[PDB]
Amino acid sequence: EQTPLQEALNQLMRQLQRKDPSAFFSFPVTDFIAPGYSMIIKHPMDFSTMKEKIKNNDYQSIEELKDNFKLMCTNAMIYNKPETIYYKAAKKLLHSGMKILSQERIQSLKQSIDFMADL
Ligand SMILES: CCN1/C(=C/C(C)=O)Sc2ccc(OC)cc21
Ligand SMILES: [Cl-]
């Protein structure tokens, strides 16, 4: 029922979420949690939204998931001040996640996804 691309995206998601042990990025940030958030952050993202996008087959490539992942981390560094736990978590998550989503790792996954096609 799921494509090789969807399955790879879900495996990468599990690796990225393990780097968020405090679960700060699990769910959408609301204006109840973060006053004025919606006026500061115009393109919100979180892991639960990414998971739903995978399930709905909204991602056409791993790079599109990588873009959403970077956006998620950047949003938290834009809204939160550097001293806060949320900013510090976002900086660490972004750095760790960019190594999980390295261009060379992505290329290798693309190859194996492509191999399942035109058989
Ligand atoms: C959901 C945790 N969290 C945020 C997460 C991200 C990704 O930004 S930002 C923030 C601000 C206040 C708060 O508890 C008053 C929590 C809080
Ligand atoms: Cl890279």
Curated annotation (Swiss-Prot):
There is a cross-link at K55, K66, K70, K81, K110 (Glycyl lysine isopeptide (Lys-Gly) (interchain with G-Cter in SUMO2)). Residues 1-104 form the Bromo domain. It is found in: Nucleus; Chromosome. Interacts with TRIM24, PTPN13 and DVL1. Identified in a complex with SMARCA4/BRG1, SMARCC1/BAF155, SMARCE1/BAF57, DPF2/BAF45D and ARID2, subunits of the SWI/SNF-B (PBAF) chromatin remodeling complex. Interacts with IRF2 and HNRPUL1. Interacts (via N-terminus) with TP53. Interacts (via C-terminus) with EP300. Interacts with BRCA1. Interacts (via bromo domain) with histone H3 (via N-terminus) acetylated at 'Lys-14' (H3K14ac). Has low affinity for histone H3 acetylated at 'Lys-9' (H3K9ac). Acts both as coactivator and as corepressor. May play a role in chromatin remodeling. Activator of the Wnt signaling pathway in a DVL1-dependent manner by negatively regulating the GSK3B phosphotransferase activity. Induces dephosphorylation of GSK3B at 'Tyr-216'. Down-regulates TRIM24-mediated activation of transcriptional activation by AR. Transcriptional corepressor that down-regulates the expression of target genes. Binds to target promoters, leading to increased histone H3 acetylation at 'Lys-9' (H3K9ac). Binds to the ESR1 promoter. Recruits BRCA1 and POU2F1 to the ESR1 promoter. This is Bromodomain-containing protein 7. It comes from Homo sapiens. The lineage of its organism: Eukaryota, Metazoa, Chordata, Craniata, Vertebrata. The chain holds residues 132 to 250 of 651 of the full protein.
